[model samples]
Target: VLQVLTFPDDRLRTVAKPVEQVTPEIQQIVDDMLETMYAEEGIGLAATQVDIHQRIVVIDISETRDQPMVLINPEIIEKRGEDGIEEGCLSVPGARALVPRAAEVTVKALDRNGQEYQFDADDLLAICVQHELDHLAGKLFVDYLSPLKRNRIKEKLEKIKRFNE
Candidate 1:
């Protein structure tokens, strides 16, 4: 089991220092991340959320439950159109915001096998890819919101974090 870092956790700000190799150690981190993701029922998780400053993202918006697709060292090749989708983060707790994102994207990434790949994604997958990508960059979706709303969320989440503790 792994702890998913929450908002106000300074550790989450650490950005991508790319995973140099796909070793057993790296795969182990990926497995631990899946365990963390399953615990929350969220569609995606980034290595950064678990306090790991590497380029790893797991996405499972598939119709099949409990199936996660991994992306390592992922980056966007092409982004088309635009849309503002209401987005939330596991780290951000209950805070949600309509963040602007590309409606369609072609992403290049590496799988668990140490192989490189690229694929086209749209809809939820596209949105999710971008969200997790942001986290990998040490960014939160709420950063897209105004300071007024962002501070409100931070203050409220403080209560929840303490309450849960």
Candidate 2:
């Protein structure tokens, strides 16, 4: 099973490289990421979360778990509006913050089968997309928080890690 790297993990800071070609291996990664996300009851998962330095993200914002969106090397072509929403990450357990995000976004990416797709998304979906994309750039949602707040959470996460170890 792919393990989700928690906060303060140095591996999470590695910038992901653009996927050159979508092979079966990449497809399998997507499937695994989807399963991992669902298992964690998360709306999205990025390759960085699993320590895979590839620009890929899987997201399902639907309550029914029917809609799955995959983005391989996604690029935010356009962004408009802004809103803050309570956001959490599978990689950062036991923490949630109201992070500002683009209310609407246009993205261009390749699908699992290497097919190009352009998406116009708004609201939660848009926010999820932007959040996942940030992981590709070696960023976390916690980066938006005040240093004091971020440090507190980091210490908490470190404590949790020590206990688990």
Candidate 3:
């Protein structure tokens, strides 16, 4: 099972490296990622969150929680519409922020077993996928935030204890 990694883990910001070969070890990592994502009650997981600077992510919105979907080297191929989505990050816990995101998105990515795939997402799923994918590119939802807004958010997140206090 993957572990639910915490914030201040420098790995979360580093641009991930591409997976050269889909070896058994790499496959195992994917498995662990799913396990962790579920345990943490998250809809998605990224390699950087675990300190693995490799292009990999897992997502599942089944509601049933019986199955998990994996995405490796994910790419957002298209997007449309504009809307604001309130979001929270696993790394930056206890804070929610309003961020603008596309209402629809089409993305291409690889599955854990080394297969190519693509899908269109809308609403919350779309936002979640985009959020996770950003981690792979060393981007975060807060990047869109202004200096004043970001500073305030950081101040609140640190001063107020929630989640894993």
Candidate 4:
């Protein structure tokens, strides 16, 4: 299983490159990511979070885990009303914070099978989509926080790393 990069990891800041073609290998990676996200109990994950510089994301916000969705080279064409919602990330671990996000979003992306699909998402799905897309652009939800809060989180995560070592 691939490990998700946590806060303060420079690798998490690497901008993902657009995939020209979705090959079987890409599908395998998506499969692995989906499995990893499930194991981590997260609603969404980006390839960048796993240190893979590919524009890929896997999300499943359904309680039954039956609605797995994959987005490759996704682009948000439009965003609707903004709202502040508490969010978390698989990469960020224990950190959760209220962040401003679009209440609805229109996205265009290719599925795992290399088929194009347009998504009109709202509420939690929209928030998760935006969050994962930010990862592809080398941004994190914590970046939306005040500098003091960001620094405090960094310090806390660093302390945890040191203790683990």
List runs of model 3 lying over 4 Å from the truth. Answer: 1-9, 155-165
Position 50, candidate 3: lDDT: 79
**Each prediction's TM-score versus the true structure:** 0.93, 0.97, 0.84, 0.96
> How high is the lDDT of residue 107 in model 1?
98
Cα displacement (angstroms), candidate 4, residue 69, comes to 0.2
Span of ten consecutive residues with least summed lDDT in model 4: 156-165
lDDT of 3 by residue, 1-165 (tens): 445444434556799988887889988998898888787777788888877889998888788997777887788999999876788777676657898888889999888778888999898888888888888987877778898877777667655546554
lDDT on C-alpha atoms for all candidate structures? 0.89, 0.94, 0.80, 0.94
Poorest 10 consecutive residues by lDDT, candidate 1: 59-68
Candidate 2, residue 96: CA error in Å? 0.6
**Higher-ranked by lDDT: 2 or 3:** 2
lDDT of 4 at 42: 92
Instruction: Assess candidate 1 and give its lDDT.
Output: 0.89
Which 10-residue window of candidate 2 scores lowest in summed lDDT? 156-165
Report the CA-based lDDT of candidate 3 relative to the real structure: 0.80
* Ranking, TM-score, top scorer first: 2, 4, 1, 3
Best by TM-score: 2
Error of 1 at 2 (Å): 1.2
